[PDB]
């Protein structure tokens, strides 16, 4: 089998991408946030603290026929940035771009922090990260991808985000019309529970490139690129008046500036991404200063090739016995 569906920004500066999963007898459908850096599928629902839903779509279980409380199980997980949600656990049908998985762990939030209730495009999360991250209790479950891998063409799923425009989430083959030239793969540890692999380096705008190795994870649900402060200030020199701002929270530019590419390394293949990839806009409705795109990892205790990076490439989870990454200019 295979599965492919369209994931679509929730905001005009790519804060996030949301895809339509359906869940439950009849459907159900809900906006999810697919995240490679976590395993847990969780969604708002009709257990949601109720002045803690806002306008959200809720995952009603009682109107599943297929839905089955998970009884004694429960969840708790917290987000990059400080976020968080926990709840009671079902199992009921979920299906992806018509890829169809029975018997999923679908966690119900009971509780939700306050950054969730104020964004009402996103309604939960679906973790594709290894299952070993999973926090469900005192029964780890297996994310939609390790219960779907069995029945697959092949045991992948590839993510090609796009920039300020829709992309595709695909499950189960590599679709050779969405990429140009070769896909470059790299090797995985799975130790940390995520898509952990080696950058061979990086440049600056049209400048030299620098052999070195960066390692870090592949991330979905982490919106911006966070990598060692020593490269991050490589980049930022390179752009008049950027400085990194505590008040602020990172690297800020002047709103004038038009921004230098960067490139990441796999193996000896290069991607690379655009300036105007890296401009978050204004820090503040009518500001001036603008925030960027490329943030210091350091106090995060690893480096996230998060959306910035990912959008730039057509990327493959390859979830085989030993696990790779691929990437792909596009």
Known sequence: STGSATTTPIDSLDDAYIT???????????????????????????????????????????????????????????????????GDVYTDTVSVGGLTVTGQAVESAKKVSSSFTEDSTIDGLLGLAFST????????????????????????????????????YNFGFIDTTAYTGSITYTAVSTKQGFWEWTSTGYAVGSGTFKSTSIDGIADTGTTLLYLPATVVSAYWAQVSGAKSSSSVGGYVFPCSATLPSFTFGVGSARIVIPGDYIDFGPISTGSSSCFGGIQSSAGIGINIFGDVALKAAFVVFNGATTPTLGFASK
């Open 133 to 168: 991250l999973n926090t469900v209790s005192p029964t780890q479950q297996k994310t939609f991808f390790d219960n779907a891998k069995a029945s697959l063409d092949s045991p992948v799923f590839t993510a090609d985000l796009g920039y300020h425009a829709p992309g595709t």
């Open 20 to 86: 339509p999963v359906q869940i439950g007898t009849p459907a159900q459908t809900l906006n999810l946030d697919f995240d490679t850096g976590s395993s847990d599928l969780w969604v708002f629902s009709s257990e949601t603290t109720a002045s803690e839903v806002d306008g959200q779509t809720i995952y009603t279980p009682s109107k599943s026929t297929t839905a089955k409380l998970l009884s004694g199980a429960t969840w708790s997980i917290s987000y990059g940035d400080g976020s968080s949600s926990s």
